[PDB]
């Protein structure tokens, strides 16, 4: 159980010998380092191996996840996602690694702080041209957790404006309606608990009326999406007037 002396003998073995001998040392030493709440030592150890073993970056990201060092995990995986030549033991695609990057990030605005989250996902929106409505909802989710509930609404209307399929539109509509529903219910509860200031009661009436607007806009938006696909669609123009 001599943790102190075991590391010292590893550190002396690394000092004594070439990098070839280090490659023998590191499988035992990284397995040793993981077994302790000594994250600074394990971080420095893991870093060394990465330029010999890219698959170990998955093990390091998993180590950072289990150590709750998600900010470091986000930095490494964003580097990995840019380093598209990466190799995975699970065979994961670069989209899935970027997806996993956004999974950790969108959950954790508080922990992740070194990164421009907005830029990264908008970068992804340029890169992953087919996934956009899902990325907007994940970007809105990040802004919900940021407490910028209005910015979530900003992203969902921005999503509705950019979307050009009914399939993507359905996903955005359903997610935004659930968001609208959840804030309407929250506004009902908080106005009853806190006592109704006149601006607070009006705030609830606004969000309901925005939800009333949302459902009534939905036929017009649905028709508009088909007009984005084909402006020449004279039938949809007649249907638009029919709604008007």
């Amino acid at each position: 159980g001599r943790v102190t002396h075991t590391r010292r003998t590893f550190d002396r073995a690394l000092r004594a010998l070439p990098i070839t001998q280090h490659s023998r040392i590191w499988p035992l030493y990284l397995r040793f380092l993981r077994s302790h709440p000594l994250p600074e030592t394990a971080v420095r150890g893991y870093r060394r191996f990465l330029k010999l073993s890219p698959e170990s970056a998955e093990e390091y990201i998993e180590y950072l996840k289990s150590s709750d060092r998600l900010d470091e995990a986000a930095q490494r995986l964003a580097t990995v996602v840019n380093d598209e030549r990466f190799v995975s033991k699970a065979g994961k695609s670069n989209y899935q690694l970027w997806h996993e990057l956004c999974d950790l990030i969108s959950q954790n605005p508080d922990k992740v702080q070194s990164l421009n989250v907005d830029a990264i996902i908008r970068g992804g929106l340029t890169r992953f041209t087919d996934q956009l409505g899902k990325l907007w909802c994940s970007l809105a989710d990040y802004y919900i957790r940021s407490g910028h509930f209005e910015k979530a609404r900003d992203v969902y209307e921005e999503a509705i404006r950019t979307v050009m399929t009914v399939r993507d539109f359905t996903q955005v509509f359903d997610s935004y309606a659930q968001f609208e529903e959840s804030m309407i219910a929250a506004k009902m509860e908080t106005a009853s608990e806190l006592g109704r200031e006149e601006e607070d009661d009006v705030d609830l009436e606004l969000r309901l009326a925005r939800f009333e607007q949302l459902i009534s806009r939905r036929p017009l938006l649905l028709n508009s999406v088909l007009l984005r696909q084909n402006p020449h669609h004279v039938h949809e123009w007649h249907k638009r007037v029919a709604l008007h």
Binding site: G123, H148, K151, E157, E158, D203, A209, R210
Partner: protein, 708 residues
């Protein structure tokens, strides 16, 4: 139209000219130091100097210099000054000498320490004079001198004598100039100040009436001066010829407003009064800004004023506000406005049903608020405590344009300073290099304002500190770039050919004609960037020159900064350039773009690596260099080409210029400063506040450090 008067080189007067001047004869009779037998003090001498030499010359710099050389301030004015003998001529003469000393960058305040007790009386007369009516005892030009003197005082907070007067004007009691609704709002936001405010009122109730009224004038001084300025500003005509005294008064006033906002002890109290006065809205809608010639320097100062007023700092604590805090403060403004809209105003329900991003852009705000009636707009502004409450049966006395601009500018999304900096080109262009208001010539008299940051003793934040340094370093480097262009192109002698092409009748060691230029690569933007990650171009030149010059041009290494220059000369062959005339008009310079050397190309189009010597002897006389272009400038140039139908600047280059390596390091330095603004400047806490000039300056001294 007479052409504007060229900046005449102020040749400072010769000893024979000095000795012949009447001012020196007065000096020799009354106060000059080398004469043992001086005449006694006579107040009429001050009046005589003021009327005949100062006012009659229209405050001519050369005459003020002669008084300064005569030691008029040190030996005659202040030493004999008393409050009982203080006249208008006496008052104004002292101010002129101080401003002259500041212009010469010599110690102005040291003379006042010989009789400090007379200065508070002296200063109060200035405050009364600064509030004098525009048609009254003091002309606008004299007031401009007073504004400049006051600006020098507000920038001189290290002098206890000056600070003791400034602190009476700029403190929490000055908020008596605020609107009552505005006052109550701010005291509710910061409940601690509400306790102090009631104490202030209770203290005013114990003062004698004369000192109370005097204190009330002082606390309202800056607010009344703004109101006075607005009267002067509204008197500026749009198309009629304006008196320069109006322009100089307005420009020096905004300078004064900038310096109050650029320093945290002053900003903390004045900004609330400044916002409530709606100064920025009044200025941006003024006829003066719409005057391209007379208002250009004023507009640059006003944009700098808009910058400091909006700065990302918590005015009460002095802490920098994060962009997340700024975003939250921005959403708080819109949420309060959407709550107000959906409660009170059925016309705004269509506005309020939109989200924040749908409304918060400047274009959207004009779109939503513009159709509304003027009475409705005022009521919105009144609820936000920006204007008094509109009576239920009265129309607004404020213009609809004022009401629209007030609501838009309060709620418009700010563009981040970092984003503006990152979008900004690092190399200067022809528009900036020869803009004499931003990059002054060697003959600049010092009479006008300059829209330049000042490295003061104190800075608002670490961000503010870096930016002011950044700008001055860039502009200083730009002045060197100007000199390098002026020297090199004059030696090359561009003249118009018979066919309308360029023929170079001369040569420059530091600049060569471009044989071919081609943009080779435009890389895609990075994550989060609206400009290319990298732009590469190839520049071909012919080095049919002397060997030592050819070795210097082939000598160019990776990261060396060069300049691409476009000249289109309109002057015939053999025309001698006159250095006293404008440079651009003589050579026909059109464009200047900076570039960075990647290296010289071999015959296969590959970059020659900077290896240890000897470099390969390349065939014949022609060389091709691969260069990096400024991606921000390239993005702007392509945007200008597409949107405005401008010509492609990159097709026009006919000269490449190199600089001396010792001086050519500026771009990489600018990148480093820019990078520092992009990084959390973790200065040690023991050192941090001292760099900003706040706190106890001795806190980092070993006797105070706990870890001694």
């Amino acid at each position: 139209m007479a052409a504007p008067a060229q900046p005449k080189k102020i040749v400072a007067p010769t000893v024979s000219q000095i000795n012949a001047e009447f001012v020196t004869q007065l000096a020799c009779k009354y106060w000059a130091p080398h004469i043992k037998k001086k005449s006694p003090f006579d107040i009429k001498v001050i009046e005589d100097i003021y009327e005949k030499e100062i006012v009659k010359s229209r405050f001519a710099i050369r005459k003020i210099m002669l008084l300064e050389f005569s030691q008029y301030l040190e030996n005659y004015l202040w030493m004999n000054y008393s409050p009982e003998v203080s006249s208008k001529a006496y008052l104004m003469s002292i101010c002129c000498m101080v401003n002259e000393k500041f212009r010469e960058n010599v110690p102005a305040w040291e003379i006042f320490k010989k009789k400090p007790d007379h200065f508070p009386f002296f200063f109060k007369h200035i405050l009364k004079a600064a509030l004098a009516e525009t048609d009254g005892e003091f002309s606008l030009h004299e007031q401009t001198v007073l504004l400049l003197f006051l600006d020098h005082c507000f920038n001189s907070l290290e002098v206890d004598l000056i600070r003791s007067q400034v602190q009476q004007l700029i403190s929490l009691p000055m908020w008596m100039g605020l609107q009552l609704a505005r006052l109550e709002l701010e005291l509710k936001k910061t409940p601690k100040l509400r306790k102090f405010w009631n104490l202030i009122k209770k203290n005013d109730e114990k003062m004698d009436p004369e000192a109370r009224e005097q204190a009330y004038q002082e606390r309202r001084f800056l607010s009344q001066l703004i109101q006075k300025f607005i009267s002067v500003l509204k008197s500026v005509p749009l198309s009629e010829p304006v008196t320069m005294d109006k322009v100089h008064y307005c420009e020096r006033f905004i300078e004064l407003m900038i310096d109050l906002e650029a320093l945290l002890p002053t900003r903390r109290w004045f900004n609330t009064i400044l916002d409530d006065s709606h100064l920025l809205v009044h200025c941006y809608l003024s006829n003066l800004v719409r005057r391209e010639e007379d208002g250009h320097l004023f507009s640059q100062l006003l944009d700098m004023l808009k910058f400091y007023t909006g700065f990302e700092i918590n005015d009460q604590t002095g802490n920098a506000l994060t962009e997340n805090e700024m975003t939250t403060i921005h959403y708080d403004r819109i949420t309060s406005l959407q709550r107000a809209a959906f409660a009170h105003f059925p016309e705004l329900y269509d506005f309020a049903l939109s989200n924040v991003a749908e409304v918060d852009t400047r274009e959207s705000l004009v779109k939503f608020f513009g159709p509304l009636s003027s009475n409705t707009l005022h009521q919105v502004a009144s609820y936000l405590c920006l204007l008094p409450t509109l009576p239920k049966n009265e129309d607004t006395t404020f213009d609809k344009e004022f009401l629209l601009e007030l609501l838009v500018s309060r709620h418009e999304r700010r563009i981040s300073q970092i984003q503006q900096l990152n979008q900004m080109p690092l190399y200067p262009t022809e528009k900036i290099i020869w803009d004499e208001n931003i990059v002054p010539t060697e003959y600049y008299s010092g009479e006008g304002c300059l829209a330049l940051p000042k490295l003061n003793l104190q800075f608002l934040t670490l961000h503010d500190y870096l930016l002011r340094n950044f700008n001055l370093f860039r502009l200083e480097s730009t002045y060197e770039i100007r000199q390098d262009i002026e020297d090199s192109v004059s030696r090359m002698k561009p003249w118009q050919s018979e066919y309308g092409g360029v023929v170079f009748g001369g040569w420059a060691r530091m600049a060569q004609p471009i044989v071919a230029f081609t943009v080779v690569e435009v890389a895609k933007p990075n994550i989060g960037e609206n400009w290319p990650t990298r732009v590469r171009a190839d520049v071909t030149i012919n080095l049919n020159v002397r060997d030592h010059i050819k070795d210097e041009w082939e000598g160019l290494r990776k990261h060396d900064v060069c300049f691409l220059i476009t000249v289109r000369p309109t002057k015939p062959y053999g025309t001698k350039f006159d250095r006293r005339r404008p440079f651009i008009e003589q050579v026909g310079l059109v464009y200047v773009r900076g570039c960075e050397i990647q290296g010289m190309l071999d015959d296969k189009g590959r970059v020659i690596e900077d290896g240890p010597e000897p470099r390969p002897n390349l065939r014949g006389e022609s060389r091709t260099f691969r260069v990096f272009l400024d991606p921000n400038q390239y993005q702007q140039d392509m945007t200008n080409t597409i949107q405005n139908g401008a010509e492609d600047v990159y097709e026009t280059f006919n000269i490449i210029m190199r600089r001396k390596p010792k001086e050519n390091n500026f771009k990489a330095v600018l990148e480093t400063i820019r990078n520092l603004m992009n990084t959390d400047c973790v200065v040690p806490d023991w050192l941090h506040d001292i760099i900003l000039g706040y706190g106890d300056p001795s806190s980092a001294h070993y006797s105070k450090m706990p870890n001694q």
